[PDB]
Amino acid sequence: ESTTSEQSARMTAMDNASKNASEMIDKLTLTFNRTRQAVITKELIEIISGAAAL
Amino acid sequence: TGRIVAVIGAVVDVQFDEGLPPILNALEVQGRETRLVLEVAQHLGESTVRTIAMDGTEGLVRGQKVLDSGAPIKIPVGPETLGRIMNVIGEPIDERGPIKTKQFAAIHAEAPEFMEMSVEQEILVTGIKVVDLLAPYAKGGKIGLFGGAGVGKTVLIMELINNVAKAHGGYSVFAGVGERTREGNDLYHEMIESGVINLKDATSKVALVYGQMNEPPGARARVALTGLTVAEYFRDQEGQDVLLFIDNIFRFTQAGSEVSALLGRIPSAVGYQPTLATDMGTMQERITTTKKGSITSVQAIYVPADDLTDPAPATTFAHLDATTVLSRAIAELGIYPAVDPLDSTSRIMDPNIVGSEHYDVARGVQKILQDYKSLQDIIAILGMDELSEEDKLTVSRARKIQRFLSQPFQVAEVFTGHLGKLVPLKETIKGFQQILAGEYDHLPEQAFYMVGPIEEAVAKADKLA
Amino acid sequence: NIVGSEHYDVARGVQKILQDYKSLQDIIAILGMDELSEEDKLTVSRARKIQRFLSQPFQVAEVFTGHLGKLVPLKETIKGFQQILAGEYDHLPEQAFYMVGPIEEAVAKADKLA
Amino acid sequence: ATGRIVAVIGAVVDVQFDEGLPPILNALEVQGRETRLVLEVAQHLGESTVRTIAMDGTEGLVRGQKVLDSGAPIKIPVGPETLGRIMNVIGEPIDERGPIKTKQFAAIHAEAPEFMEMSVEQEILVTGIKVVDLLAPYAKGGKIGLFGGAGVGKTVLIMELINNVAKAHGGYSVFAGVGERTREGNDLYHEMIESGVINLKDATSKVALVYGQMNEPPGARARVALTGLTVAEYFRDQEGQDVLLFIDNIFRFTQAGSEVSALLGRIPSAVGYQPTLATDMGTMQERITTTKKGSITSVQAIYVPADDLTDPAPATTFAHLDATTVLSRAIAELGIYPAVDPLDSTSRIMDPNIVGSEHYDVARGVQKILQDYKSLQDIIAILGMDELSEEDKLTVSRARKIQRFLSQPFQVAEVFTGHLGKLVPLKETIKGFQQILAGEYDHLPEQAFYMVGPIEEAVAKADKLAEEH
Amino acid sequence: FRDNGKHALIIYDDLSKQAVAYRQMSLLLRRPPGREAYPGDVFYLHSRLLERAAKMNDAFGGGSLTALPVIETQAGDVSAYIPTNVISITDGQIFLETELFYKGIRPAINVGLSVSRVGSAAQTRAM
Numbered sequence A: 001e002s003t004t005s006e007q008s009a010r011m012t013a014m015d016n017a018s019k020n021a022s023e024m025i026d027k028l029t030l031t032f033n034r035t036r037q038a039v040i041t042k043e044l045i046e047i048i049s050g051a052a053a054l
Numbered sequence B: 001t002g003r004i005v006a007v008i009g010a011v012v013d014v015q016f017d018e019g020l021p022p023i024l025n026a027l028e029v030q031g032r033e034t035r036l037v038l039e040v041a042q043h044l045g046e047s048t049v050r051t052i053a054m055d056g057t058e059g060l061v062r063g064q065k066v067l068d069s070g071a072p073i074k075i076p077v078g079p080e081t082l083g084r085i086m087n088v089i090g091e092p093i094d095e096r097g098p099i100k101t102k103q104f105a106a107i108h109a110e111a112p113e114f115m116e117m118s119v120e121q122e123i124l125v126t127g128i129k130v131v132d133l134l135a136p137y138a139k140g141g142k143i144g145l146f147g148g149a150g151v152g153k154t155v156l157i158m159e160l161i162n163n164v165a166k167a168h169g170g171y172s173v174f175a176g177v178g179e180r181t182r183e184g185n186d187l188y189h190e191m192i193e194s195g196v197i198n199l200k201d202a203t204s205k206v207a208l209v210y211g212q213m214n215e216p217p218g219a220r221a222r223v224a225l226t227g228l229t230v231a232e233y234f235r236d237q238e239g240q241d242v243l244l245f246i247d248n249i250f251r252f253t254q255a256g257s258e259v260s261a262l263l264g265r266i267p268s269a270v271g272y273q274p275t276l277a278t279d280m281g282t283m284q285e286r287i288t289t290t291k292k293g294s295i296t297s298v299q300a301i302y303v304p305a306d307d308l309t310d311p312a313p314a315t316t317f318a319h320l321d322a323t324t325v326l327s328r329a330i331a332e333l334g335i336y337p338a339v340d341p342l343d344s345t346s347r348i349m350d351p352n353i354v355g356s357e358h359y360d361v362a363r364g365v366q367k368i369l370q371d372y373k374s375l376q377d378i379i380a381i382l383g384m385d386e387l388s389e390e391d392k393l394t395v396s397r398a399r400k401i402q403r404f405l406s407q408p409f410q411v412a413e414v415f416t417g418h419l420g421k422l423v424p425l426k427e428t429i430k431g432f433q434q435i436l437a438g439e440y441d442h443l444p445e446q447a448f449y450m451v452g453p454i455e456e457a458v459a460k461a462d463k464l465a
Numbered sequence C: 001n002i003v004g005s006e007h008y009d010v011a012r013g014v015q016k017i018l019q020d021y022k023s024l025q026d027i028i029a030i031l032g033m034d035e036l037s038e039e040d041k042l043t044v045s046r047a048r049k050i051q052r053f054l055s056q057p058f059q060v061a062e063v064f065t066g067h068l069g070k071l072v073p074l075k076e077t078i079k080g081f082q083q084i085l086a087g088e089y090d091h092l093p094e095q096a097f098y099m100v101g102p103i104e105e106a107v108a109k110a111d112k113l114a
Numbered sequence D: 001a002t003g004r005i006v007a008v009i010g011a012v013v014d015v016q017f018d019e020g021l022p023p024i025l026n027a028l029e030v031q032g033r034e035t036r037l038v039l040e041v042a043q044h045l046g047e048s049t050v051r052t053i054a055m056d057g058t059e060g061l062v063r064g065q066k067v068l069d070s071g072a073p074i075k076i077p078v079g080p081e082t083l084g085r086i087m088n089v090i091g092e093p094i095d096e097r098g099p100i101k102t103k104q105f106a107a108i109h110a111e112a113p114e115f116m117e118m119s120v121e122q123e124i125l126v127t128g129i130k131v132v133d134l135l136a137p138y139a140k141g142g143k144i145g146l147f148g149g150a151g152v153g154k155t156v157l158i159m160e161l162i163n164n165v166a167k168a169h170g171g172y173s174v175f176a177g178v179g180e181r182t183r184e185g186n187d188l189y190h191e192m193i194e195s196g197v198i199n200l201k202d203a204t205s206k207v208a209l210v211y212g213q214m215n216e217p218p219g220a221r222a223r224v225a226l227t228g229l230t231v232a233e234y235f236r237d238q239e240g241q242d243v244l245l246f247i248d249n250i251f252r253f254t255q256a257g258s259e260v261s262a263l264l265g266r267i268p269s270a271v272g273y274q275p276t277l278a279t280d281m282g283t284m285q286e287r288i289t290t291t292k293k294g295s296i297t298s299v300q301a302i303y304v305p306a307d308d309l310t311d312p313a314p315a316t317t318f319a320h321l322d323a324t325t326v327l328s329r330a331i332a333e334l335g336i337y338p339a340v341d342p343l344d345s346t347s348r349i350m351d352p353n354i355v356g357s358e359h360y361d362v363a364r365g366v367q368k369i370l371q372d373y374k375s376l377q378d379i380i381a382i383l384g385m386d387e388l389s390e391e392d393k394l395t396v397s398r399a400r401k402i403q404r405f406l407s408q409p410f411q412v413a414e415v416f417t418g419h420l421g422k423l424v425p426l427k428e429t430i431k432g433f434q435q436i437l438a439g440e441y442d443h444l445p446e447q448a449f450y451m452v453g454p455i456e457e458a459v460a461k462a463d464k465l466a467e468e469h
Numbered sequence E: 001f002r003d004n005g006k007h008a009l010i011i012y013d014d015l016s017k018q019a020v021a022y023r024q025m026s027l028l029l030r031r032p033p034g035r036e037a038y039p040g041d042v043f044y045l046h047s048r049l050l051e052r053a054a055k056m057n058d059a060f061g062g063g064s065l066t067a068l069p070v071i072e073t074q075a076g077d078v079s080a081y082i083p084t085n086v087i088s089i090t091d092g093q094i095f096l097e098t099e100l101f102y103k104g105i106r107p108a109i110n111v112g113l114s115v116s117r118v119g120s121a122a123q124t125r126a127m
């Protein structure tokens, strides 16, 4: 009985550790995409300001 | 006349004397072999205009002679343009003789006024069971076609041409915006072998506009305007219900942000042009339902770097009214067309637009197709027989529904041997209203695979055994 | 020197139990609560009451929630963070520590949810 | 032909001539100073106005100082007499021992040899370091690169190859130091007198030295590396000997040209470098070659800015290097020294037709068990070490002994460690690693291989730890 | 209407597409961009417009003017440049969730993040 009680709780506790790791994986995908656009925007201004002052 | 003063890349500057032409005109260089059309974009002062070229610029000497048309780029338009291939300036590029017609039209034309718009939504019926039931098409709206190669996209293009010319009587224009030459040749010969274009008589159903990929960046941005002038002839002069295909819309945006950077302008956010919201405005507002007829547009959408909030697929998304997505995971299941029923949305899906009969039928189909999506995981991991008897019918019915969405097309009669079926609207709503209630559940699964209406389903259960 | 040797020692114990809780949030979010130690189910169970004891009902926000504005003296916000860091109140829930004044109203709130 | 100074902004001086315009890349002598100040022409601007870069400082310059012209670029003195001397960018001696008296003067600006003047033969040059000779062997007459961040050991590892290689070598040797600390050019002048390589009493020295350090104006940290490989071109061409060449650092050749750039009138490229970045780099790196008149071994240290090998200055030197030795801070913070990354170092002669089929299947046998050790760490973070099977509890314990066996106690790092200097030969490096892989040392703990020489000392160190229980 | 004793109501729809139109005229005049390539005076654009919506006293007629601007966010981003320049002006918020609009709750009003500061004292005592 104890090896069935244990092997079913390994099924549930490894299931909520993949829901919480996929809930966390979308929130870092939005922050990765805001920051990816913000670096192309930032280093574009430095080239324009470098050429305008020249 | 004028003279060329400066040649820098694909940007030519022209000096005039008396007749300074306004913006959006079209000049023509004298002394060269092929036509080289320049488009005026800025008045630089002291009688000097700033022009963007439309072909190769080399061989141009400072101080040549340049005429003026006095009007924008004017293309051959008419009903005898069906079945031909033209570039952005109206020239034919298939060596079948010059196109001869009565009148011409200009590509830079204003939007319809406010008192000419339609005051009501109206569904366009195309015959396909999965399109006209779950993600229906508004008349005049813009449609986004998700999916690429290897999914069966170029058949769905060739079949919506055929059905509108049968049930509605309206032709179509195809506009290839910066498309490959190798893939813009196969679509020529795939349409020949399916009947929608014809080299022998005047029963063609499309006109091809191909601005290919190796052309200067000014010539890849005006192709979606040349291919909209032709679509405005069959509404303003004859009153048809036209379709319009652009492939794709990202190469219209990206070709805009290379003219606005060759002209010396400060870029906006991530690299685009400052004018990203008006170039999408002064094109897609001419695609509308006036009082004479309509123009409906199906556009392919490519999302860069899988970012749904990038400004190129975010400007476009405010114009669309319905999206259909071609999933490859339904193409390995055997279903054709490979349109996903759960991940397609429509804006006109509404009880105050399409009525309550269409609504509560198409609402229950997407709910039952979710329960099979949630119960397919317990069966794959745990097993089959543990679930209830009320759930065994939902497993059986949802395999009847997702095979009743298949339909044999008229464009594929030679290959797969079946008969092409065009289903009207009142059969598709009547069909799925009975599958949900358990009315035709005792028949097996393969009676529903690749049929027309619900009448031909029970005529196929008799032939089994 | 300036604020004393008793104010300075309770104020540094609060920043110690709130930093160790901040280093376990990457594990509690994945493997849950049942994977910690037994002594580390006490840093979590005590930092989740000091966090709620840094809440206070303001006086100008009476028209927001309708609660009374409370003011505490400086000598009584030293006594409130000693009877939590020592372990005197390990028989009360966290929500009894929520939006009160001094430490005496925390035990006058836990008798309600009995 | 005299000329006047019309503008001074920073390190960029404008000079207007009247009748004779000197060409680009020349030398102009500023009359009026007590020191010697040389200007190098860089651009033309029209109406007889050039724009120069200054080799020394520009304080005390006034508009109107008459400037002479040389008619030739910076001609340094060169010959056999320059051995054992420190010299400046323009050829002045700064060792304070007198004038360098020789007969040959040579400009620092010259062409690259053609395609039918290249050599094609490959060899192997043995060093004695266990990580280098096993997984990424160096070569005679081949360009070698030492990557890595700041503070991982690029100056010590380039101090090790002067210790092993330069005293057993027949021909001469040249050390050019470009843009590094002026302290460390004194710990080389005092670690090469007490080893007898530099001799201050007669004519038997074997090392020349060229130094432009990080206190110089930025027009002088970009012409010192061209002065190093001008002396080292005399020995290869006018004589026939086998030359070495050590350069540290070479990132300070690119950076010192990214500072004078915006005043010369150039729009910046990507993250801040000049638009002509990959052209003047490729104009210097095509003179450090092995021709049909000699051979130049060359070791170079390459600073990688803030641990990012995708920066445009280190990620364009990769096309000019045969053997890359990528150092890493993630290994050095374990205690494994020298921190060389095994899964990021390559060579062009890792080839079973050149190093034999026995060395080749040992090198790839080490990288395969280290890379398979990487994918196993992702499981231990959730499961644990003990819940693994007994079959992959062994490939971890074989990998951890291979990580620790690569670390070797260096000789010039005695004052850091106190341990002694080991030098394992090539035939012993292969035979040490066959036996850990095959399983002949599964009865020892991991600590018996840390900082040892050959495999013989790995078991002598194993018993000495046992008795203190 | 406000100055002549009447009450008005105005719905701007939307103030997001105004600020992408002021961005275009600024960069076409070669002005230095800032965050998200916006000009430096975007805060002057929306504050000098939404400061007019006020209620006069009884000595000035007693009229009013209510405003209700609309801002569109990209995937729930209430921490961007433009949706924080307008939160720091208006006297409250109303939040519309795109993941309660899909679950069938309509109108999908986030009751947790919707606040109205000054307008709580002016409602019916029956309500």
Ligand SMILES: Nc1ncnc2c1ncn2[C@@H]1O[C@H](COP(=O)(O)OP(=O)(O)O)[C@@H](O)[C@H]1O
Pocket (backbone or CB within 6 Å): D149, D150, D151, D152, D153, D154, D155, D156, D157, D336, D337, D338, D339, D410, D413, D416
């Ligand atoms: N043989 C060695 N192995 C590992 N680390 C070393 C060795 N020699 C020096 N180091 C470490 O490298 C650091 C930097 O040394 P050095 O090579 O002079 O600097 P850099 O590589 O930045 O020029 C020192 O702090 C020292 O601890």
Ligand SMILES: [Mg+2]
Pocket (backbone or CB within 6 Å): D154, D155, D180
């Ligand atoms: Mg160093």
